[PDB]
Each structure stands twice: as structure tokens, then as C-alpha cells.
């Protein structure tokens, strides 16, 4: 596998000009348009989604935060690419069978991947379960997945594209962390 | 709460001179003799054990490794003290109710604690395996570690209550060990 980057799927991500995805104010990811991505779309929908448990996301900055609560998670896709702006933590050559991957499709071998992260201070902070707004999920499919997986996506018929939308809306719930007394 | 340290309980830990527990060749932890410990002993046994999931231990060095596998864990006690040897990762004022604590007794408020751990983990040529405590070692852990950390309560326990602590330690402490 080519080196991968974890792209958190939240309500705040946006496509940026030229193969880049803004995760938040502090995190931007580039993807390789012709790279081999672990997460995959096909005529059956989206596959190989990573569930990062013990983590929440600071939604405004785009940085994952370790919360030490196993019931916290953030989900995302793994794609060939790199963190261009932001702190990255790299996992090197982990057996793919070790990872918490759902909707598994043809996963095998060892994966190297990086996460956007940022001592941890959990004073005065609340973590909340968030689901994707349904309008934003459509923009995620039309502006994000359709750019990363342009060729596959353009090959899909309407029923298949709607399956991908349903998948995105079903799957990408997450926990976001926020400070109660500071902004 | 005074600041805590996560003390992993493995087959390789031992008491060392002047208020220290050697976890392995890279990690030693000092306990404050008059500190207030989150983990506690009483006439019903051991309480407030932390299950650190997503981590396995390099048992020889004593260092905790993030494995990004939710099925790996290392169990341990939280005590007032310091990581004297080895690098540390400090969590500040996490609400106690968010932590994966078992055998809970009067868990409230929030907890600052440190874990014995540049921005990568190398899991190539590595496999984690489940390990349980050898009974001979659980006994030495009670007699030489817990009996020093909790000397005043331990000395106040009768024989059967001391032995309950040992059965608790035996049953509770198992962990994932990472081997290259």
C-alpha cells in the first residue's frame, strides 16, 4: 500500500483548489489523484472506513484529540495522500487486520497512515455525538468523494450515486470536542 | 486529586530501592508515600483499576505502545507519583467518569495522570499477544509492590483480606504484550 492519510468526515470539511481538502482551520490534506486508496467506492457504495475510537475531533480546527474514552470515535476514509498543514502522527506498517475498519472490501497486508492530531488538556471540555447534516452529506459526496474518486463516481448511475449518499449519511457520525468556557 | 501516574501491572514489574517500582528497563515510577491514590485498597480488595485500551506493553522495557487496535489493552493502577525514568504523556483534568475504570469505588471529579510512552509508532515486525499474570508473580506483586504503596491499609488488613487482594490481582491483571 502507498502511504495513506486519514480524512475525517465531518460537517466542516470542504474541497479546496487542486486536490486538497480543508479539514478545518488548522488541518489541510492533499490526496494523490492517481494514488491507490484503501477506502474505496464501487457499484455497492463506500468501503473500508476507519473508525478511530478513543478520539474526538475539534471540528473548527480539524485536529483529532485523544479523549481516553473508548466510546468516543471519529470515522474517516483512508486515501493516498498527506497532511500538508497541521500536526501529523504516523502509524507505520500496521497489519490491516489490526485496524478498526468497517464495510470491509479487499483489505490486506500492512498499512502506513497518518492522522491529523493536536500533553492533552481535557479540562472544561464537552464531547458530543454528531451526525452529518443531510445537505452537507450531499456536498461531501458531490464536492469531496466525487473529486477524490472522480472516475469511479462519474461511471455510476443515479441509483448507485444515491447509494453512496445514503452510505455517507448512515456511516459518518462522530464525536466532536469543544471547550465550554473558551472559544 | 494530586497528579497521578499509570502504573502498568505486568509479570516483569518489581519494587526497587526508595519508593520506586521498576516497570521495565526503560521505565521506573516513584510513588509518593503520603500521596492520595486514585486506585485504592480496602477490606473488600482492590478498586479503580484503569483499562488502557488501544495500547500494548513492551514488557521488557516497560514502555506503553499505541497499537491503534481497540482490542489491545494494558491494565494498571493510578497512584500519586512520578515517571522517574522513561518518557511521559500527561492527560490534564479528564472527567473521571470518561475513563475506563473498573471495580469503581467513589470515583468523582477529574483526574490528571501521566502514561509511560517523534510523532510516530513503528508497528512493522510486531505482534501483540494476550498475557495473564503468573500466580507466583501476583503474590510478589501484592507482597512487594502493593504492600509498599498501600503499606498503612495493607498492614491493617487481616490475613484473609490480604489474600483477597492477591486473588483480585490474579484475576484482574492481564494485558497485551507487544513483541517484535
From Swiss-Prot, chain B:
InterPro entries: Cmr7A, CRISPR_Cmr7_comp
Subcellular location(s) of the protein: Cytoplasm
GO cellular component, as recorded: cytoplasm
GO biological process: CRISPR-cas system; defense response to virus
UniProt KW keywords: Antiviral defense, Cytoplasm
Residues spanning the signal sequence: none
Quaternary data: Possible homodimer. Part of the CMR ribonucleoprotein complex, consisting of crRNA plus Cmr1/Cmr2/Cmr3/Cmr4/Cmr5/Cmr6 at 1:1 and possibly 3 Cmr7 dimers. A Cmr2/Cmr3/Cmr7 subcomplex without crRNA can also be isolated. It does not cleave target RNA.
Similarity-based family: Belongs to the CRISPR system Cmr7 family.
Function: CRISPR (clustered regularly interspaced short palindromic repeat) is an adaptive immune system that provides protection against mobile genetic elements (viruses, transposable elements and conjugative plasmids). CRISPR clusters contain spacers, sequences complementary to antecedent mobile elements, and target invading nucleic acids. CRISPR clusters are transcribed and processed into CRISPR RNA (crRNA). The CMR complex degrades RNA complementary to the crRNA (target RNA) within UA dinucleotides, generating 3'-OH and 5'-phosphate ends.
Protein name, as recorded: CRISPR system CMR subunit Cmr7 1
Highest classification ranks of the organism: Archaea, Thermoproteota, Thermoprotei, Sulfolobales, Sulfolobaceae
Gene: cmr7A
Amino acid at each position: 500500500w502507498e502511504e495513506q492519510v486519514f480524512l475525517p468526515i465531518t460537517n466542516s470539511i470542504s474541497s479546496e483548489d487542486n486536490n486538497q481538502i480543508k479539514i478545518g482551520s488548522s488541518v489541510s490534506i492533499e490526496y494523490n489523484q492517481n494514488g491507490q486508496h484503501v477506502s474505496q467506492i464501487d457499484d455497492k457504495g463506500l468501503h473500508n472506513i476507519l473508525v478511530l475510537t478513543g478520539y474526538a475531533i475539534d471540528e473548527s480546527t480539524g485536529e483529532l484529540v485523544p479523549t481516553f474514552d473508548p466510546c468516543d470515535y471519529v470515522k474517516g476514509i483512508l486515501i493516498s495522500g498527506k497532511i500538508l498543514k497541521g500536526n501529523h502522527f504516523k502509524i507505520i506498517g500496521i497489519p490491516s487486520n489490526k485496524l478498526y475498519i468497517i464495510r470491509k472490501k479487499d483489505v490486506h497486508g500492512n498499512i502506513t497512515f497518518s492522522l491529523p492530531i493536536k500533553q492533552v488538556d481535557l479540562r472544561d471540555k464537552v464531547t458530543s455525538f454528531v451526525s452529518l447534516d443531510r445537505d452537507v452529506a450531499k456536498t461531501i459526496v458531490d464536492n469531496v468523494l466525487a473529486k477524490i474518486y472522480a472516475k469511479i463516481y462519474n461511471s455510476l448511475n443515479k441509483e448507485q450515486k444515491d447509494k453512496l449518499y445514503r452510505d455517507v449519511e448512515e456511516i459518518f457520525n462522530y464525536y466532536s470536542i469543544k471547550s465550554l468556557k473558551s472559544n
